Write a protein that binds this ligand. Structure first.
Ligand SMILES: Cc1cccc(C(=O)O)c1N
Length: 119
């Protein structure tokens, strides 16, 4: 029932994501010089270094907020991809499955801790 435990759990999950080869296209903001039409398609860029920095700055109040930004990295990849068979999009799908498999317990534990606090 530790209400703060999600933060280190998210830090550790981001460390695993950064070690995953599938995260490399998503570690830093998409290069606008390499993809000059990116901002014509994508309204809100997001990347894992921005997520980690937001977490480390104490600018997430809950793991749900972190999860919304990570999901935005994946929806941006799906929206920008020219093909559902593209290399970078395929990497995003695998990374998303890995993230969802690991974030589930973080969210469950946090929500349970909050319910216990308000019991
Ligand atoms: C950022 C991004 C997401 C999804 C697909 C691509 C691609 O160039 O195929 C891409 N550059």
């Amino acid at each position: 029932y530790d209400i703060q435990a999600w933060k280190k759990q998210c830090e550790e999950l981001l460390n695993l994501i950064f070690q995953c080869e599938d995260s490399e296209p998503f570690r830093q903001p998409v290069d606008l010089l390499e993809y000059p039409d990116y901002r014509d398609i994508i309204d809100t860029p997001m990347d894992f270094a921005t997520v980690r920095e937001t977490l480390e700055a104490g600018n997430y109040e809950s793991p749900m907020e972190l999860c919304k930004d990570v999901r935005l990295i994946f929806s941006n990849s799906k929206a920008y991809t020219p093909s559902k068979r593209s290399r970078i999009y395929s990497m995003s799908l695998r990374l998303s499955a890995f993230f969802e498999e690991h974030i589930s317990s973080v969210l469950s534990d946090y929500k349970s801790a909050l319910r216990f606090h308000k019991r």
